[PDB]
Amino acid sequence: RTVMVNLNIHNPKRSSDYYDRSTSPWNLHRNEDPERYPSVIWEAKCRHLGCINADGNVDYHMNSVPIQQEILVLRREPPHSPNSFRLEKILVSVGCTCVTPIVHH
Amino acid sequence: RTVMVNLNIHNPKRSSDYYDRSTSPWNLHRNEDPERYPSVIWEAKCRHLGCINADGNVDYHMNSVPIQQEILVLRREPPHSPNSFRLEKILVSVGCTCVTPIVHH
């Protein structure tokens, strides 16, 4: 059953500095879709294929893995109607962690 | 201005295995609130204060940092009304990455 929602949505600068110092750091991707509220979502492109060991060099005996978690968003449906909507759940990389491979040939 | 939403929301087992092999792994916290759609959100408690170097031991010269990203959720408001709602944006740890400290006394 449909229902009402009031669209009135209800220090950041420091977390980027910690994430930039990660050993499996990432950049941002402008995942934008207009028939979608929120209009713009920023996701994580991992910056390396490996992780960054003590030298400051990439270590390909490790993996940067992007962390994917589903989140809630709205799609205008009928695909053109600015009124009617649906709650949708979509998958978005939210950052990267470093994982050890299992296989070593 | 308020609007309508149809609440019809629109392999997982393998990503946990990669995350369990992270060097800054995490557990799940049942962040539940009934006057909140979604009812239950699972967040990341980092499993260590350091990261897990080659031995399989914790390395306290590093930090497990939980990655925090805001997500969209609904709050029943008036706080009891099952009809009226608001779109809210809340902060939730979505996983952990390993970061190098800056200070070394």
Epitope: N27, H29, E43, C46, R47, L49, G50, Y60, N63, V103 | -
Partner: nanobody, 125 residues
Framework: QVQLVQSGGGLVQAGGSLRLSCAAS????????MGWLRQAPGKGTEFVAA????????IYADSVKGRFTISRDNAGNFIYLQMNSLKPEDTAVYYC??????????????????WGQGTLVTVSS
């Protein structure tokens, strides 16, 4: 999640260059590690190159190192492979793949999923 379309490639004499292209139809792969594999018939599936989600980190097989380059857009809609100074060793069916798993190093083909039929690149003696 997406379909992988490939263009470029054909028949070339040694020392020459092809430039293969691979596109994301029905979805993007912006945040996905990408790569290229190759297989000549009867033989196993070789690694060729892999590219960072951001496009900033690139690895190459020890057979193509210094000849081949991998790159990509930022839209998540294209990855490219450029093959210079071609040798008949290089004769194979090429596949762009997405890195779907993480069971090995970035170099480990078994972590990449090709979608379609390949791209034939024949290099002449």
């Amino acid at each position: 999640q997406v379909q992988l379309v490939q263009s470029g490639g054909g028949l070339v004499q040694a020392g020459g260059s092809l430039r293969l292209s691979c596109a994301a139809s029905g979805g993007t792969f912006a945040t996905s590690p990408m790569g290229w594999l190759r297989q000549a018939p009867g033989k196993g599936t070789e690694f060729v190159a892999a590219i960072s989600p951001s496009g900033g980190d690139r690895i190459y097989a020890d057979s193509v190192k210094g000849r081949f380059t991998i790159s990509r857009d930022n839209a998540g809609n294209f990855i490219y492979l450029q093959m210079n100074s071609l040798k008949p060793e290089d004769t194979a069916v090429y596949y762009c793949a997405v890195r779907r798993r993480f069971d090995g190093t970035s170099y480990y083909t078994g972590d990449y999923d090709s979608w379609g039929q390949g791209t034939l690149v024949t290099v002449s003696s």
